RNA sequence: ACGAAUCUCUUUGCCUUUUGGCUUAGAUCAAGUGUAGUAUCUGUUCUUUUCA
RNA sequence: UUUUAAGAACUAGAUACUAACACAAAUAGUAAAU
């Protein structure tokens, strides 16, 4: 459970730099827009 | 390869009595009804212009152990079922023979493999109301022995014969083990 | 890849299916076959049949054994017949330089630094640190005599 | 066929080169059997020096022998007579039970003889020419009860 | 009301009690038993037909 | 229950067996040809 | 083997006194049918022969059940935390 | 605890599956196998006594304990010639063996059969034995 | 036919061959409902050759126009590292 | 009955046959001997794996390799004629992998024949 | 007189429910609180025979 | 032929174990921290 703790300070960051981390001049990657949102991701960024 | 090499096991009398036949051969074909493992399953149609095609549905491992005609399932030599031959044979001598087969799943498959064979291959309304009813006689042979001179409700717990018919010249005819009444209101 | 994804749909998975000897699961088999190559010498030096109990114990001194050589232990059993002994020490001696060795050759993989795992260097200072005290009280006994 | 007699493992044989029949070992016993009819054939004079590593043999009829108690042990094959016994001298700094001997062959000529040891060593064995009876001879040939 | 067999959980599941297990045929052999095989049947009939009354 | 074998298995028991037929990639052929020696 | 051997001789003693107090206290045939052999023999002695054995297997039974209470009830110096430490326990003092 | 024939049943399907389970893992464990065997005969079956036996005896033959008591099984429901073919195998597969020998003969001297023991220490002697088989015959 | 088979019912193949769930997966429904390098492969293998074939099929409409179609499956051919995802199956797909 | 008895075992089977003379004679087979064992061996494998290889599902590995009915006496004469597949549909429609124990089954027995004082103390 | 069988006890023998694997001892070794459920640790006072 | 539980009532809490229950609100069995 204490492996746990940890990734919860460090998620805030990837999102506060989500809009290059997800973009749309990316090499390669399967677009899927998210479920019943108006978002594309660009392949699997889980943690976003 | 030795699974074609004991060939098939065959009846020369229900195998059809054309001059010329074909069959087939499937290498793995069904598993046997009693074994259930494969084997090279053989068709053929009995003459040419048949609609039924006959099959064959065992082993040649199994149908050795207890000698019998892969189509037909009777034995090989007298033509006869098995619970049948290894009872008559049980009976002269008297008492043994019969074949104990095989529950359960792996006990009948293992049991395929020893080569002992088994006991049979060892060797080779107008209410009518009559009474006296007889325990081991059926309406079939009672409506039986009435058409055979010439319709029916039995009770054979009571042993008593109810009986009923389509019209009272019936009733002359009838007449025209056994108590009588001419029974109706 | 297909043709064999359906015949595994309609002939099920094989039973048997023996498997091999690889990286994660060496150890365990090196071990397996050790002992069974002990049982073998100890059946044959015993006189006749007696064998399963006097077995089975006779490798507890053999894990015994090992675990005392590491920890440098001089393990003397009170009393047992000469010429087991011997084959325990025989083997011990076997493992022993299997041991040495691979401590050996995988610190020289590491200071290359070319792709050792996670784990082989944890363990790896372990082998160490054992090997270096040895050493020393080797050093020091030889001080004195 | 099978071959029961032996009594314990049977680790190791050897095919005659000639003969048409294989020596087996056994622990501390060495028979030998004919091929064809599976005989008896021989049953080498040894008391119990085994555990019987390995066999090996030759050309000429010779039979090796390894021990583990670090004894070869050579005999004559047609006989049981054994004729010769040596000590391994074991190593520099080995353990008494590391004198051992895991392997044997003999070359192609019959003459010279390899060896492996548990002492991390192969040992070659070669066939003293001086011999003949001079005072060549070994255990002197006393046949007992088996 | 008769009592459950236990289901099945391979599908090959072997319930011991209906068939004998692997059969071993103790052998033939010259001495010809076949008499004791009757007082053995008259002896296990008699046992199994006994308990269904008294009750053990 | 972790327990030092006192046995192995036999391969008898597998050879009884009937077979699968999947195909591996190591059988699939591979130098096809044998040579002899003079 | 020289065990097999007494407990032969003992056995001859003891059949002794069972036909002699028997005197105290008062064939082989063929099927040319089949190799099977067929001898006769009275359905006296071996009622004997069973009963004596099933009394040999109750005394040795007793014997060694018997040495359970003493054996179990008697030696209490080591530590136990159950009936095997007692057991065990006891085979390491037969051990010097 | 036992009512009538339907609870003898279960009592036995369920001992039967959990022995069968233990030799399932050992089929080595020899002392299960005989136990086993035995609860078989307070069963009063006897054929599946038998078997059990017989297979006890396909793992190992070396083991005259289980030979022995194969025998006994057999000759405590007073059933002989079961108890002597058994002895030719016996014998016959391991004749260096004297318990196998002096139990075969003492089966016959209780039986007082005679022109057996004679023809049977003729085989037992025609092996060149050893001294303790000329001095007992 | 090939998933149903396998008792899987609660996954859909929708008309461009995406394979989705329906309803919230249980574990252990997701370890029996993994699927393989094959299966998966291959779909995306077919949706490639939808995807272009559709083009074509628009065409015949009389929606599209020749250019329009060309330049269609120019693009399909060089953005399939984006339309698919099949270098998710075979990583070595990535040279071409 | 002597031989009844004890029936298999016999001493001659203890015996052995160079005690007597050495010298006795063995031969090593011939010639025209082992290029006949050889060959029936060779062909019987040959079968084998010509099996093996045309079973399985490389359809290029098989590249690298009768009326046979009188039955009854043949009495109806017969011919026996494979049928092609629809090579679709598996092939081997009654294979599968199960798993079976097998009767170890023997007429005959093996008799086997070899030849707690002072030991104790060392064992 | 001695021999034998039976019961009982003792000693020896037999071992009877009589330690079943491997890796870095396989690694790590105390920092809480509220309420609640269960386990169970003390004392006090009175009293020691039977039939329809 | 078996067989003796010292009997009954009162009372309190003290050491424990535990519980995805409760202190801008969120963690789990490949990895853990100056
Ligand atoms: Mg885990
Ligand atoms: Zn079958
Ligand atoms: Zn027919």
Redesign the pocket.
């Known amino acids: 459970?204490?492996?746990?703790?940890?990734?919860?300070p460090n998620r805030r960051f990837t999102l506060w730099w989500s809009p290059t981390i997800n973009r749309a001049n990316v090499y390669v990657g399967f677009l899927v827009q998210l479920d019943l949102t108006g978002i594309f991701l660009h392949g699997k960024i889980p943690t976003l | 390869d030795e699974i074609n090499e004991p060939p098939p096991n065959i009846c020369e009398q229900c195998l059809g009595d054309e001059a010329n036949i074909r069959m087939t051969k499937i290498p793995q074909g069904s598993e046997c009804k009693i074994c259930t493992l494969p084997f090279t399953l053989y068709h053929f149609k009995t003459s040419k212009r048949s609609n039924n095609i006959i099959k064959t549905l065992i082993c040649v491992r199994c149908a050795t152990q207890r000698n019998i005609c892969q189509c037909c399932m009777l034995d090989s030599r007298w033509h006869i079922p098995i619970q049948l031959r290894d009872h008559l044979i049980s009976l002269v001598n008297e008492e043994n023979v019969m074949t104990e087969e095989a529950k359960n799943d792996m006990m009948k498959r293992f049991l395929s493999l020893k080569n002992v064979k088994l006991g049979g291959a060892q060797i080779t309304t107008k209410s009518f109301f009559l009474y006296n009813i007889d325990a081991s006689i059926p309406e079939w042979k009672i409506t039986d022995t009435v058409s055979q001179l010439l319709s029916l409700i039995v009770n054979h717990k009571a042993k008593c014969g109810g009986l009923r018919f389509q019209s009272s010249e019936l009733g002359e005819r009838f007449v025209s083990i056994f108590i009588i009444p001419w029974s109706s209101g | 890849y297909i043709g064999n994804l359906i015949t595994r749909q309609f002939e099920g998975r094989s039973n048997e299916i023996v498997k091999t000897t690889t990286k994660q699961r060496l150890?365990?088999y090196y071990?397996?076959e050790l002992?069974n190559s002990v049982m073998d010498d100890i059946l044959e030096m015993m006189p006749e049949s007696?064998r399963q109990?006097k077995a089975?114990?006779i490798?507890?001194h053999?894990?015994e054994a090992?675990?005392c050589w590491?920890a440098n232990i001089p393990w003397d059993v009170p009393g047992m017949p000469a010429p087991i002994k011997k084959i325990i020490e025989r083997y011990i001696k076997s493992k022993a330089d299997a041991?040495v060795s691979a401590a050996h050759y995988n610190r020289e993989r590491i200071k290359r630094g070319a792709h050792v795992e996670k784990?082989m260097v944890?363990?790896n200072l372990?082998?160490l640190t054992?090997l270096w005290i040895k050493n020393e009280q080797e050093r020091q006994r030889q001080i004195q005599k | 066929k099978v071959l029961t007699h032996h009594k314990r493992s049977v680790r190791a044989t050897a095919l005659h080169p000639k003969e048409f029949s294989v020596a087996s070992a056994c622990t501390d016993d060495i028979r030998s059997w004919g091929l064809a009819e599976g005989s008896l054939l021989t049953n080498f004079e040894s008391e119990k020096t085994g555990i019987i590593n390995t066999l090996s043999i030759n050309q000429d009829d010779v039979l090796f022998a390894g021990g583990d108690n670090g004894v070869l042990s050579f005999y004559d094959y047609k006989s049981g007579h054994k004729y010769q016994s040596l000590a391994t001298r074991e190593m520099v700094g080995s353990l008494e039970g590391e004198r051992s001997v895991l392997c044997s062959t003999f070359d192609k000529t019959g003459l010279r003889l390899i060896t492996g040891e548990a002492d991390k060593s192969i040992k070659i064995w070669k066939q003293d020419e001086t011999a003949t009876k001079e005072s060549e001879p070994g255990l002197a040939w006393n046949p007992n009860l088996s | 009301v008769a009592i459950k067999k236990p289901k099945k959980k391979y599908g090959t599941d072997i319930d011991y009690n209906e068939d004998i297990v692997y059969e071993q045929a103790p052998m033939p052999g010259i001495y010809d038993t076949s008499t004791e095989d009757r007082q053995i049947k008259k002896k296990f009939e008699q046992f199994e037909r006994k308990v269904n009354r008294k009750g053990l | 229950s972790?327990?030092?074998?006192?046995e192995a298995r036999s391969g008898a028991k597998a050879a009884a067996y009937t077979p699968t037929g999947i195909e591996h990639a190591r059988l699939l052929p591979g130098h096809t040809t044998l040579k002899y020696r003079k | 083997d020289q065990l097999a051997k007494l407990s032969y001789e003992?056995t001859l003693?003891?059949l002794a006194?069972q036909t002699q107090n028997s005197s105290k206290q008062d064939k082989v045939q063929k099927d040319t049918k089949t190799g099977k052999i067929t001898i006769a023999d009275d359905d006296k002695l071996v009622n004997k022969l069973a009963v004596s054995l099933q009394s040999e297997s109750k005394?040795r039974y007793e014997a060694?059940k018997?040495?359970?209470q003493?054996a179990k009830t008697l030696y209490g110096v080591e530590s136990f935390i159950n009936?095997?430490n007692k057991?065990?326990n006891?085979?390491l003092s037969?051990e010097s | 605890d036992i009512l009538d024939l339907e609870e003898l049943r279960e009592y036995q399907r369920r001992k039967r599956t959990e022995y069968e389970g233990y030799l399932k893992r050992?089929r080595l464990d020899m002392g299960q196998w005989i136990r086993y065997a035995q609860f078989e005969i307070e069963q009063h079956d006897m054929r599946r006594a038998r078997s059990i036996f017989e297979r006890a005896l396909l793992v190992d033959s070396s083991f005259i304990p289980l030979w022995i008591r194969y025998i006994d099984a057999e000759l405590k429901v007073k059933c002989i010639n079961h108890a002597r073919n058994l002895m030719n195998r016996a014998i016959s597969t391991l004749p260096r063996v004297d318990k196998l020998w002096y139990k075969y003969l003492i089966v016959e001297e209780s039986l007082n059969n005679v022109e057996i023991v004679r023809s049977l220490y003729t085989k037992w002697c025609s092996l060149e034995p050893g001294v303790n088989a000329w001095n007992s015959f | 036919l090939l998933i149903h088979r396998k008792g899987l019912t609660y996954l859909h193949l929708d008309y461009n061959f995406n394979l989705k769930p329906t309803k919230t997966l249980t574990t252990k429904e997701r370890k029996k409902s993994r699927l393989g390098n094959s299966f998966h492969l291959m779909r995306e293998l077919l949706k490639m050759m939808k995807l272009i074939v559709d083009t074509h099929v628009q065409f015949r409409l009389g929606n599209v126009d020749a250019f329009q179609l060309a330049d269609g499956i120019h693009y399909i051919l060089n953005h399939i590292g984006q339309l698919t995802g099949i270098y998710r199956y075979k990583y070595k797909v990535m040279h071409q | 009955l002597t031989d009844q008895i004890a029936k298999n075992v016999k001493l001659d089977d203890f015996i052995p046959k160079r005690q007597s003379n050495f010298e006795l004679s063995v031969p090593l087979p011939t010639k025209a001997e082992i290029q006949e064992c050889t060959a029936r061996t060779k062909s019987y494998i040959q079968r084998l794996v010509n099996a093996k290889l045309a079973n399985s599902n490389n359809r290029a590995s098989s590249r690298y390799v009768a009326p046979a009915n009188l039955l009854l006496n043949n009495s109806h004469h017969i011919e026996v004629v494979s049928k092609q597949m629809d090579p679709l549909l598996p092939r081997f429609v009654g294979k599968k992998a199960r798993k079976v124990v097998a009767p170890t089954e023997n007429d005959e027995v093996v008799p086997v024949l070899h030849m707690?004082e002072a030991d104790?103390n060392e064992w």
Do not use: V, Y
Not at chain 1, 1 to 8: K, V
Not at chain 6, 2 to 6: C, F, G, N
């Open positions: 459970q204490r492996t746990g703790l940890s990734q919860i | 150890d365990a071990d397996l002992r007696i109990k089975r114990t490798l507890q053999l894990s090992w675990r590491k041991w784990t944890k363990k372990g082998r054992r | 972790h327990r030092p074998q006192l | 003992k003693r003891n006194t005394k060694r018997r040495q359970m003493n009936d095997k057991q065990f006891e085979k037969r | 050992n | 707690g104790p």
